[PDB]
Amino acid sequence: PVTKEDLGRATWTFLHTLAAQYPEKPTRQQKKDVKELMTILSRMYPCRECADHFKEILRSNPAQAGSQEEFSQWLCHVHNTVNRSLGKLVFPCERVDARWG
């Protein structure tokens, strides 16, 4: 049950939905939790290789949690790096808000 793909789809839904709700002017804690959440995922994501790649991506592209727009975009760019590595379509990050409300 639950393949690498099912996990990915579920998590992206959670992450992008989360970035869709992120506040315009986040508090110091909300900013901290978002960054901590990504760090935790870089170590804990339930798919070995996937977690290593996320770790790399996170190293070179730290989370932009300054606001809803920066986080939504950042998360979309991160998702695209994975898409590209897998030979999948690359999503236009100007439409993230249209895809995730």
Place this chain on the structure above:
Amino acid sequence: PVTKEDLGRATWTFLHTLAAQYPEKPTRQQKKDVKELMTILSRMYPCRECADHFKEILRSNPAQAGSQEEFSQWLCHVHNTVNRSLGKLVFPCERVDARW
């Protein structure tokens, strides 16, 4: 157009899979990360009411991450508590390593 219900299903799939892959003998960091992960969720979970409900549950049921079995079990109970309040069927918590 993700719904409150699609968010929930996605999240439980993530959590439960995470709890199914948790190590038998977690390190000090892994225990810490899993715990902080639940705390982050109770503040950050999208649906407002849902965040507050989960926050009260975590209050009286602090996360147990001493091992895969304990974490799986704790997560399973914390989920039945939610199903219950929603009028849903209860999942027997010996069957966690089943759905996940």
